[PDB]
């Protein structure tokens, strides 16, 4: 029984180090692979926090610590239930992977290159801006891949799980060689 | 007693919980008082990560674990050592406390209401968009306070430790009476 059992310090050390790397050599949604990994770390954080409080409850020094550790664990796992319900409801309205994510319950859908590109959205305002840099399209903080200005979509949609909003392309401009700028305005609102 | 390590479980329980709260309630900047706090936390992940690896190099289980803990601590040291070098050099050009943030090395300066508003900018590109919602200005993810479209600045600047860029107001439009939209195009580049 007289063991150190302190190897968890290496486990937590590496976990913190992973967070530093994600926020330093990635952070920005430059590609889908890094973004997906970041979303996983933002998910696993839930059971890790929960476990920390549970251990305090199990090896509690006294009943005061026990009661507190249990109450704290009850909150962290009370929120996870929420993360789920909201994600499930979004999924039920749509039919895509992106419906399950810790950041937001609103999706942006932009038709490109013969198909539709979907990303999580943290906005849903009257006006959505778009910027084209060296032939690449960037919207709402996400890279949507290659798209020239002359072929920029005239319609995009946003799904909030309660309502469906349709946006229409307004004025657009070219700003040097293959760069430019555009904006979308809500034109219609439908309900689910 | 066994070092009453249950206390360390409580500390990490609370520290992790802080990130769960910040990333759910203090997202997308918005309130300057939440943003300025979030920036504090990230500045205390280099000493926490380091302490975890350093402590493990004292309470060693074996030589292999010790060697790894030391190597990892060394790497975490080199991270904090860059943040300090980069921040001081930026400060030398732009004498503002915003130069000491643990996110980026670029500052955005937008003149408003008789003064100049400064915020961290994630990247410097040819075109910077601006959105006005119900009389409030949002640029590069930051809220810069109240600004009507008719009062929108004709020039903004972006400063780094090496160069200085000036952006000229280009196109603008009113959308929905109170809301509106504009874009800024880089027109001049300077050095230092």
């Amino acid at each position, epitope marked *: 029984l007289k063991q150190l059992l302190e190897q968890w310090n290496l486990v937590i050390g590496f976990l913190f180090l992973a967070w530093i790397m994600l926020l330093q050599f990635a952070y920005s949604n430059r590609n889908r692979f890094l973004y997906i990994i970041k979303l996983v770390f933002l998910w696993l954080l839930w059971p890790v926090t929960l476990a920390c409080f549970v251990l305090a409850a199990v090896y509690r020094i006294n009943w005061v610590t026990g009661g507190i550790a249990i109450a704290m664990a009850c909150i962290v796992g009370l929120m996870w239930l929420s993360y789920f319900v909201a994600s499930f409801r979004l999924f039920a309205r749509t*039919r895509s992977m992106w419906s399950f994510n810790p950041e937001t319950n609103i999706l942006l859908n932009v*038709p490109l290159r*013969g198909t*539709i590109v979907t990303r999580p959205l943290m906005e849903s305002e*009257l006006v959505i801006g778009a910027v084209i840099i060296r032939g690449h399209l960037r919207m709402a903080g996400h890279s949507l891949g290659r798209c020239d200005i002359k072929d920029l*979509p*005239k*319609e995009i949609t946003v799904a909030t799980s309660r309502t469906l909003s*349709y946006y*229409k392309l*307004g*004025a657009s401009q070219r700003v040097g060689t293959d760069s430019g700028f555009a904006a979308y*305005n*809500r*034109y*219609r*609102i*439908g*309900n689910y | 007693l066994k070092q009453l390590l249950e206390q360390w479980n409580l500390v990490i329980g609370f520290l992790f919980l802080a990130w769960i709260m910040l990333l759910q309630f203090a997202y997308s900047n918005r309130n300057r008082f939440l943003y300025i706090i979030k920036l504090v936390f990230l500045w205390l992940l280099w000493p926490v990560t380091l302490a975890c690896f350093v402590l493990a190099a004292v309470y060693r289980i074996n030589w292999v674990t010790g060697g790894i803990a030391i190597a990892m601590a060394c790497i975490v040291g080199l991270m904090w050592l860059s943040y300090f070098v980069a921040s001081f050099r930026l400060f030398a050009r732009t004498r503002s406390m915003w130069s000491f943030n643990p996110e980026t090395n670029i500052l955005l300066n937008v003149p408003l209401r008789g003064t100049i508003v400064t915020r961290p900018l994630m990247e410097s590109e040819l075109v910077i968009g601006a959105v006005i919602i*119900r009389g409030h200005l949002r640029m590069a993810g930051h809220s810069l306070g109240r600004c009507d479209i008719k009062d929108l600045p004709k020039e903004i600047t972006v400063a780094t430790s090496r160069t200085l860029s000036y952006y000229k107001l280009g196109a603008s439009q009113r*959308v*929905g*009476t*109170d809301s509106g939209f504009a874009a800024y195009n880089r027109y001049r580049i300077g050095n230092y």
Partner: antibody
Amino acid sequence: EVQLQQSGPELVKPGASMKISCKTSGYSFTGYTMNWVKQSHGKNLEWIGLINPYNGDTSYNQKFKGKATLTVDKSSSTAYMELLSLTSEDSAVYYCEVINTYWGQGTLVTVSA
Amino acid sequence: DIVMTQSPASLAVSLGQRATISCKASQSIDYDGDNYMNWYQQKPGQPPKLLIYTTSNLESGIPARFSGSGSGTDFTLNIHPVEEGDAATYYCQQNNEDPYTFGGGTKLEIKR
């Protein structure tokens, strides 16, 4: 640039059914919604329904429900409206529209013996 | 089942004079403080075209002579420098609710 070519006029008896075939071109077939209008005798615009050619997910109002079926054929870049149990009040100029901008030329439907 | 009506049945307007068409809604819309209302134009033998969207956003390709405004339940279409080519039927659409509805249509005639 963008076209919405109609199949042309047709005449049927009461109780008959038909399919209105709209052929488009100039853009990728999917990615934009489709809307139908009736414009009945006289000068009155009306909304029949909306569909998403990418995956279905149709939506109708409560008055035209059961009177029409809206479908799509991705292989020919077309969209169809199936007219059910046509009566004397169904004679009209039917046509497709995309985003309140582009319209078809009009398919004249006459219901009469 | 949201009813919209226009006040005039038709207008008789001389060249160079302002023409106006008004419309009222049974509902205030009020979505995040924004009202919705589209205005359309139709000529004989042709499908309609959109002129104005969301109460005030002029459609591209439409001349500035067409100025839309209003708020709440009161919507107005103002055509100031009326010309000889402005001879068409104008319509309203709410563009806010699942049972989308249109107005009755107002006919513009030009005096000569």
